[PDB]
Design a binder for these strands. Structure first.
Ligand SMILES: [Mg+2]
Ligand SMILES: [Mg+2]
Ligand SMILES: [Mg+2]
Ligand SMILES: [Mg+2]
Ligand SMILES: [Mg+2]
Ligand SMILES: [Mg+2]
Ligand SMILES: [Mg+2]
Ligand SMILES: [Mg+2]
Ligand SMILES: [Mg+2]
Ligand SMILES: [Mg+2]
Ligand SMILES: [Mg+2]
Ligand SMILES: [Mg+2]
Ligand SMILES: [Mg+2]
Ligand SMILES: [O]
Ligand SMILES: [O]
Ligand SMILES: [O]
Lengths: 87, 46
RNA sequence: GCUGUAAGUAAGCUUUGAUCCAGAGAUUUCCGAAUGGGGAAACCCAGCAUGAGUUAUGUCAUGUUAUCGAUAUGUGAAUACAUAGCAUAUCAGAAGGCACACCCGGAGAACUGAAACAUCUUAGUACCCGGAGGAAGAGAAAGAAAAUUCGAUUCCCUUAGUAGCGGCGAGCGAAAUGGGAAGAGCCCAAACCAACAAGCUUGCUUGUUGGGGUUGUAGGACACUCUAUACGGAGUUACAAAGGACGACAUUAGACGAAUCAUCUGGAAAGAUGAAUCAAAGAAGGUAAUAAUCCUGUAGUCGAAAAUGUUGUCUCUCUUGAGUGGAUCCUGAGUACGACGGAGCACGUGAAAUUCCGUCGGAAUCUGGGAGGACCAUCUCCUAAGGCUAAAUACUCUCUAGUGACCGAUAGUGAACCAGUACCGUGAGGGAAAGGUGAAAAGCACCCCGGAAGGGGAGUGAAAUAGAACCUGAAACCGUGUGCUU
RNA sequence: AGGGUAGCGGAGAAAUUCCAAUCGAACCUGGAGAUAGCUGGUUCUCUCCGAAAUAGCUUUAGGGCUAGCCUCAAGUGAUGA
RNA sequence: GACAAUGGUAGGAGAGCGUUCUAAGGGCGUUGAAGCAUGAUCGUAAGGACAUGUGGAGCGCUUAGAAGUGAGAAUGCCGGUGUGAGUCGCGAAAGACGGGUGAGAAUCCCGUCCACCGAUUGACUAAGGUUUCCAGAGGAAGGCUCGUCCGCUCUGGGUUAGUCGGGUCCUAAGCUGAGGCCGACAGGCGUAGGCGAUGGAUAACAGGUUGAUAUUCCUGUACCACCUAUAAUCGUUUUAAUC
RNA sequence: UAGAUAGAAAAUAGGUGCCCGUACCGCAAACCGACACAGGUAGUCAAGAUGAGAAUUCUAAGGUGAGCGAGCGAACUCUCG
RNA sequence: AGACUCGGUGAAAUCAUAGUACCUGUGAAGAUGCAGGUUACCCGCGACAGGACGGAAAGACCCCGUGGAGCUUUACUGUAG
């Protein structure tokens, strides 16, 4: 439900980090974001592409802090905890 | 009607088993109220 | 975001709202009841009409073409009459399929028990056939019973393994009174009238509609008195007659849906440690390890353009309802009953009622007839010989939502996986074995030997003695070496 | 080569021979987990007691029933040896 | 503290252990569960703890309840592994040499010689099987050995008809069989007609050609039916040409 | 012949001509026989010398060398003289 | 030709554990496994075949079963016709 906005990945390899997302993959439920870099290899010794994680993620717009995203009233449109700006 | 009718048991004088018919009476006639023919009983032809 | 499982590549689509979800509609090749003919199922061959293309034939497109019956026609003649038949047209008719379930009916067994067996039981089971339903059957007293009588049927309990049947052995087995679930009662036939009909005896009677009328404490007819009036009404489309309008509710896609931060360990926390929060929501599952406060979610609330289903009120239809008197008539005929052989009633021919079957004989008409377990009498009760009937009940091929002191891969469906498969058999038919990498494919770049396979190294990863015949990896079995010994 | 007859049956120059490698009555499914007085098999320890192989009857003698002979819990109460 | 008993099958009575699950309570667990393995340990027994290694996520304990509750033996079912055994066999048969290939050849290709069948181990078709056919690669298993090869795998590719066998022609045996006769239902019989060839009738030959097709392709030469176009014969639509 | 129907077409030119099957083995390695199995598997052609002859012996046509072999040359079994 | 040695490939019915003598005796009354004596260094290979009451086949003979089928008859009871 996300198309390249901000997040804070909290509960994975290394946390406290943020970044912006690529394909959400609705079926596998796995998003692509800067924060994991597999050492893939083809015939280079390594490749350093970008890999995915399950949704252990959260958004942050006004508080500059993770909150439970909360799609609220119809004006649909997002309406977060403390502040209500677009997703 | 033309049916083996009443198919049940037949006891002997000491009551062994045996199946029978009681094949109901029917004799054929030029019917006296319609010019065709068909099996017909006697009990009706009184 | 998408182009299934099923990777991958390339081409492309998509806020001008894809894909996806739900409802309606359109298509829906061929075989198959198969239905124009034929046929070794999925092929072949035709016919007629119309219409494509040819100069023309060959060739094609669509439509149509079976049987049976049941209606309307004509036509029919072996014989003149005119029927049998014959050609044509109409029908949303039927045929078939199935859920091996539940129901009714036709037919209908044996092993077995009996300590053997023929009566018997198993059993009126199985399978077979047929029919219909979503439930069926039954059914509104020619009962049950013996009193302060009740007044369709069915099912559950109980009476009762009692009373009884029985080579009186095996064994079989009610019913009633009573307590409960559900509760519903109605139309014909007949005697009477009108109409039309052949015999018109110019006598009226039979043939067909409409009325008329439906019963035991007798009733109707017929005669008489009032109600109603084309309706005051009851109507009740689930029986009782068969048609149609218009609101509410549920179902088939969905949405909202309260709440947490940090330290240590870790590859990774959802754990320990602390301090905090929501609760109509601490059900559940997933999330790199065990989470009410990360996601899906739940409590609760909202929501349907269209379609369906059930319910409601006006339309809608359709309808007279009682009473007395009983002079005269009517109350279901080759029926009921008897005998003869049989079956079934818990009941084996027994004293054997009551009910059904076949042959044969053969009653009565309300001062009548049947039952009350042989049969007669008195008493009591009921009125066949015509028909319909919801619910209570039995089952679940299937769907929705749920559950388990149920199984967790030799268990459980035979079947967790590409199974009624491979396979076996001519054929009916019988029938297998086989789950798991890791959190994520990050699925071993690169060097080396090697023809390859395979391997040693280097690296991905916490771990590759997790490296695809990939979690864990026992015992048998096989080896390599070695302390002691021969 | 194409066809027929099908098991309570058929066909048989007849032997109880053939009927999809089987025939003193084929084959598959269902009744059906048929029946068996017969054989075979019956899963974890200890403690206490402890037999019989006889009588009778048995279309019975390798089975059964009753009495004997055992065990357990009550009762009797010195009756037993 | 004394006294006495304590072999034991069928079998009777009694007390007991552990497994799976449930309920409740209280506890353990990445600072490594369960299981597994090792061990010189506890208990009278069935059995249970402990330490260590491997293992990588759930488990114990007390009280009680319900059980598909225990397996050495069924000529038991299934699975795996041996024993026999590197033992019998390797499915009639005459091969040898050279040259190539290849990582590697008694077995593969090439040739020369030799031997064998020859009313045939030859050539052609039917039934039958279903792509085995041909080319190019490959050798994991199959081949009763080896294999650089195959009828095995992988990729690709191959079957041509107016005259041929057959259908649009016929029919027996037999099968089906409108109406119809019979039967408890099912269904059974059977006329009309219809299907059904191994038979009857039926218009074609020779050569060439591909790694793989041949009366099918081309090359030449022929035939039957049919339509269209054209004219030398007909003359009531009779009869005559004519169907 | 009943019947159709005005009234042909000699030989000429031109064209039209459907479905199935067709590969391969087919006394075999490919069919039935569970096997790349010493079995069966209808039919057609079937040459040469010798011979009555499709017999027999040896060869054409053409096809094959049989899917384990090398040693030694004992028992024993089998096949032949 | 097989067998036998070398190379290649590589089964089976069977199988309580085994480091598996003989005699005379005992014994379920015919012993590798017991008692008493006797002789015999460990391990092979090729041959024979007395024993392993050897294997294969829940004994085809005999008997039992209140087992079963087929068949006969002036056995019973019934029956189609
Ligand atoms: Mg219909
Ligand atoms: Mg009688
Ligand atoms: Mg009668
Ligand atoms: Mg397992
Ligand atoms: Mg014979
Ligand atoms: Mg049994
Ligand atoms: Mg006793
Ligand atoms: Mg075992
Ligand atoms: Mg050479
Ligand atoms: Mg063919
Ligand atoms: Mg052969
Ligand atoms: Mg000759
Ligand atoms: Mg050897
Ligand atoms: O059985
Ligand atoms: O059984
Ligand atoms: O049995």
């Amino acid at each position: 439900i996300k198309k390249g906005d901000n997040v804070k990945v909290i509960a994975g390899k290394d946390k406290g980090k943020e970044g912006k997302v690529i394909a959400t993959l609705p079926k596998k439920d796995r998003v692509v974001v800067e924060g994991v870099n597999i050492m893939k290899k083809h015939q280079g010794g390594i490749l350093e592409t970008e890999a995915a994680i399950h949704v252990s993620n959260v958004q942050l717009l006004d508080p500059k802090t993770n909150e439970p995203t909360r799609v609220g009233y119809k004006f649909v449109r997002i309406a977060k905890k403390s502040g209500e700006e677009i997703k | 009607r033309k049916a083996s009718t009443g198919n049940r048991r037949s006891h002997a004088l000491n009551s062994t088993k045996r199946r029978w018919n009681a094949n109901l009476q029917k004799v054929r006639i030029l019917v006296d109220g319609k010019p065709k023919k068909v099996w017909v009983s006697a009990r009706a032809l009184k």
